[PDB]
Motif scaffolding. Sequence first.
Motif, PDB file in Angstrom:
ATOM      1  N   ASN A 114      -6.676  -2.843   7.145  1.00 10.44           N
ATOM      2  CA  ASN A 114      -5.238  -2.962   6.933  1.00 10.44           C
ATOM      3  C   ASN A 114      -4.789  -2.115   5.752  1.00 10.44           C
ATOM      4  N   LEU A 115      -5.737  -1.540   5.022  1.00 12.61           N
ATOM      5  CA  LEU A 115      -5.431  -0.718   3.867  1.00 12.61           C
ATOM      6  C   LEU A 115      -5.737   0.746   4.158  1.00 12.61           C
ATOM      7  N   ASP A 138      -1.331  -0.359   0.680  1.00 14.60           N
ATOM      8  CA  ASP A 138      -0.898  -1.185   1.803  1.00 14.60           C
ATOM      9  C   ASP A 138       0.255  -0.501   2.526  1.00 14.60           C
ATOM     10  N   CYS A 197       3.736  -2.550   2.826  1.00 18.77           N
ATOM     11  CA  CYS A 197       4.510  -2.923   1.650  1.00 18.77           C
ATOM     12  C   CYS A 197       5.822  -2.153   1.606  1.00 18.77           C
TER      13      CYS A 197
END
Lengths: 159, 52, 103, 50, 203, 125, 119
Positions: E111-112, E135, E138
Amino acid sequence: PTFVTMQRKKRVLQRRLKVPPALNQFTKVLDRASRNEALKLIKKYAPETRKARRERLQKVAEEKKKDPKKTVSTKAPLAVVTGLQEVTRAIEKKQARMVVIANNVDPVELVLWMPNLCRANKIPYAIVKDMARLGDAIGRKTATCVALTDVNAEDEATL
Amino acid sequence: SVPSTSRAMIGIISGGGRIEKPVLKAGNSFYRFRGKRNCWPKVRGVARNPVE
Amino acid sequence: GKTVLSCRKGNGSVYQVHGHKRLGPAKLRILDYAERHGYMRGVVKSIEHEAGRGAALARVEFRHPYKFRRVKELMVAPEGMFTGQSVFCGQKAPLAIGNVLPL
Amino acid sequence: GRFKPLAVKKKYAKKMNQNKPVPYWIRLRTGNRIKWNEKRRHWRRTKLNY
Amino acid sequence: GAFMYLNELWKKKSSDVMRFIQRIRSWEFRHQHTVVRLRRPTRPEKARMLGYKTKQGFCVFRVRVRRGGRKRPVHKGITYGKPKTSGVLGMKLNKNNQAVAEQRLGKRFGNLRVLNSYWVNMDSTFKWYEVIAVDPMCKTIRRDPRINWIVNSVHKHREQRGLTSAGRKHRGLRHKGHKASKLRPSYRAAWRRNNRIVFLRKR
Amino acid sequence: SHHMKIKDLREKSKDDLLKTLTEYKKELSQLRVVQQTGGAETRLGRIRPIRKSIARILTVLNQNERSNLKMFYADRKLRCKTPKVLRTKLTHRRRLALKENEKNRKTSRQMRQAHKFPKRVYAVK
Amino acid sequence: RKSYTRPQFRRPHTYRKPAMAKPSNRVTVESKDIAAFNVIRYPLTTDKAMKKIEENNTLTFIVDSRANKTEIKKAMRKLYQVKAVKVNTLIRPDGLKKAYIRLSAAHDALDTANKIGLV
RNA sequence: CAGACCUGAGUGUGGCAGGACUACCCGCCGAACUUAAGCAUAUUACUCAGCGGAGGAAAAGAAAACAACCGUGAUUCUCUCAGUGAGCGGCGAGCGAAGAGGGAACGAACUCGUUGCCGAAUCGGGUCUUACAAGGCCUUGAGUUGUGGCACAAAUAUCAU
RNA sequence: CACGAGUUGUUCGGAAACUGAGCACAACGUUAUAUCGUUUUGUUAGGAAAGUGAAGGUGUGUCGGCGG
RNA sequence: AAUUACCGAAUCUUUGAACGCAAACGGCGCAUGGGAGAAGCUCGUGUCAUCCCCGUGCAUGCCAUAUUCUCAGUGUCGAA
Ligand SMILES: [K+]
Ligand SMILES: [K+]
Ligand SMILES: [K+]
Ligand SMILES: [K+]
Ligand SMILES: [K+]
Ligand SMILES: [K+]
Ligand SMILES: [K+]
Ligand SMILES: [K+]
Ligand SMILES: [K+]
Ligand SMILES: [K+]
Ligand SMILES: [Mg+2]
Ligand SMILES: [Mg+2]
Ligand SMILES: [Mg+2]
Ligand SMILES: [Mg+2]
Ligand SMILES: [Mg+2]
Ligand SMILES: [Mg+2]
Ligand SMILES: [Mg+2]
Ligand SMILES: [Mg+2]
Ligand SMILES: [Mg+2]
Ligand SMILES: [Mg+2]
Ligand SMILES: [Mg+2]
Ligand SMILES: [Mg+2]
Ligand SMILES: [Mg+2]
Ligand SMILES: [Mg+2]
Ligand SMILES: [Mg+2]
Ligand SMILES: [Mg+2]
Ligand SMILES: [Mg+2]
Ligand SMILES: [Mg+2]
Ligand SMILES: [Mg+2]
Ligand SMILES: [Mg+2]
Ligand SMILES: [Mg+2]
Ligand SMILES: [Mg+2]
Ligand code: NA
Ligand code: NA
Ligand code: NA
Ligand code: NA
Ligand code: NA
Ligand code: NA
Ligand code: NA
């Protein structure tokens, strides 16, 4: 828990091994009586909060709009210099009358050179017992270092 | 040589003299190793092939 | 060539221990504070035979030094151990057969 | 024999329903090409093995 | 500025004070996990150079890699064929350990987006690298022009494709001109150009 | 003929739509009895029109419910808690992709340089 | 600091806010009244089925294969206003589920068979 | 004692990863048959098979570049250089590029760190403006262990009114 | 071969609901690569994996008992 | 209300990365909304124990977050 064991074992071998002078200087902190007085002077000249700064600038806007010809000063009230970048510049430009350095900064490489930089510039400095106590004085959670550039007339004897 | 704080029990271990009785039978060796492990019967290497 | 049978035995596979029908590991009781300073008194409850082992095993009943419960060790019996025997384990234990003492 | 999973019994049930001949009226359609079911199965010929 | 003192401090890595600091840290890093999330980077000056900002959506992890060369995973060290391909222990992986640390972080947390990494410590058996990750979901990341690009899909798992700085190093992309002719834009792109058989229409 | 018109269905309420649905489901079940017990061909020809009238009733009920719930969650305070079934599907990538607003974000220096030197339209003689 | 009487550390129990109920992700309109028509599909009119009506007061139906014996009893009440004192179900070798529904003595199975239309 | 902040847990809230595809493309791993009229370096081949990861293309890309000129000027591709009086090679079998030149494309350029001047002007979250505004107001929440603004060769101020 | 039928359970067998030889999800470690390893000798994991709760305090219901 | 073609509104069973837990089991759950209820209570009306049915949430890891949630540490302080 493993983090409980490792933080206690950490402290054990920071005493077991031979610590060079550059790190041992942070274990020899200013005495409690002088630490309390220094923190009281730093708290007296703490920076203004978000609310206080924005009310001052709102008034300055009104005094600007009263007459667009004349320029109104936006200078903040006299306070301490706070922040690694700003405190360093006060030392290099030799504007700091005193510098207060915290002893438990981790990584220590942030402030490991401050005593030597203050000493080279003949600027009084002190290493104090906590970076959270320094943060409380200025109104933040922590503070690595604080510099006093000037004080009012009634606080010159204290400084 | 062992540290003097290590413990020991007084006496000899029981069941002594077991090795003194001949087995007399390949079937008695079958039951002796049934509780131990898979190691019996034992083929001699001279009786095998050079590949093994 | 092919692998030698002695090297094939180190893989485990069908050459492992036939541990089913074994009671367990036979050990002395833990070297706790009572052992190190005083003694622990236990009672031999049974003398047992373990598959694959030629020496008799003894189940010795001790009280828990900290809780309200029994422990029931299992160790290799010395010769002459009988059921109902009192077993002393510790620093202050007397020198009798079946007692566990520091060397 | 008596034991079978319901999933296995339901696959065997569908195979039973597919084991029927082509309807007679299918052969009378305009472009018809089907005369017999080419997927007929007998238990003694081919095994489903479910 | 204050950076100048942290930068020159980390060039004296063999000094007594830095050997003491690194010895306490290497001992501490041993008793942690292989991947460890940190609130703040151990070297903020190095992290900021490589793209880290103290904003929402920037993360730092410390990744551990075992030191030494690559042992060829052949059963019993038995290899077949020409004796040229018989070596088991002396061969070396064609990817550096910084790229291995980045890829082990990126495969674990998908997810990063891995941005960069830097060297913090090494011990006799271990090497520690701190990986900057972002991220994509974000709002702070998604509205900042200076990091907006990483939200795009071409940047998914860029560390697995050798696109990070450590990956560019072992691909030879540090060099240009005559030091890099056979490996530009890639070793396979240069191979296809030199080895494909061209059939002009009229010839 | 057992054909419910869509225009008539869209004028009914949710209660009338559900009462009509029960009436048509009951009559379809009586036609399944006729299927087993022989049955006239004209009666068995009523099965398909009924099954499609049931689909029409359920289409108006579900189309009305989705549009009514989309209006409910269109409020500014409720847009955050909208069920994913009522959100826009699009594509997995398009939902995670940067919007046009976020794609076009510029720094202060970038905006000033675009105002200082805008691209001109010109020609040559 | 605290006093610990166990030889190892275990996680302390802290305050746990309960999970909230989300808006439903299923918004399709489902009628409660028409659910009995899915449970009971149609009756069986074979020789064995007809034999049980006269002597065993039993009605034979093809039901949902995932239907429950308790649900078949409730569906017979809603659809035909009768009480089933016993339901026996089997899943047929063609995959369908057939129910043997015996009515109470208060209800005549032949009278209800006539009302259904299977006579 | 409280309390803090450092490190670390638990739960609530909002999200993301997972698998498919995989012709082309990116990273790694990697043979042997075959050729050498045998064979071991070599060749096949930095190829097949294997493990990862994207996209409509990917990768590369704005000089720590060529050159050695009257100088050129990010990358990518094409003809050509050139099967080479380059080079590598049991100098055997074999292998083997680059600059320049004619072209395709090209509005092609920007961002951070640092250094100087500032210093929370920053970011999230609430609420309002028809607005989850690049907006106003509030907010310790995050951030002073630094994020944001100005100027760094296409340059010679910016900041007011 | 065609057409139509036939398998009915509170107690029968299984599951719900046991352990065995064993397996291997999590956890951790390893590996360019998880599609690898450990995972019952009482038993996972450098390891904060218990959401269960003796007594006692607070109110409700069902009672016995003293006094008015 | 033909039928074709196209598509904006919808339906979309059991599974599968499959993700509450399992599985040659159309099996078993915990929280939370409902549904039906011929025992019992009430005056065939209401209500409804056990049983039964259905919707939603519930894997692991990571990130962000908390009207600034609840905690742990012989970590550093600070006050007792
Ligand atoms: K088969
Ligand atoms: K080229
Ligand atoms: K969540
Ligand atoms: K040959
Ligand atoms: K790039
Ligand atoms: K050219
Ligand atoms: K039976
Ligand atoms: K495994
Ligand atoms: K109800
Ligand atoms: K503490
Ligand atoms: Mg044998
Ligand atoms: Mg022989
Ligand atoms: Mg049989
Ligand atoms: Mg079978
Ligand atoms: Mg290698
Ligand atoms: Mg049955
Ligand atoms: Mg040959
Ligand atoms: Mg040969
Ligand atoms: Mg090669
Ligand atoms: Mg391949
Ligand atoms: Mg293109
Ligand atoms: Mg690209
Ligand atoms: Mg060029
Ligand atoms: Mg030529
Ligand atoms: Mg070659
Ligand atoms: Mg900055
Ligand atoms: Mg037949
Ligand atoms: Mg077992
Ligand atoms: Mg074991
Ligand atoms: Mg263990
Ligand atoms: Mg499942
Ligand atoms: Mg799974
Ligand atoms: Na064993
Ligand atoms: Na049978
Ligand atoms: Na080898
Ligand atoms: Na994938
Ligand atoms: Na060939
Ligand atoms: Na060219
Ligand atoms: Na048949």
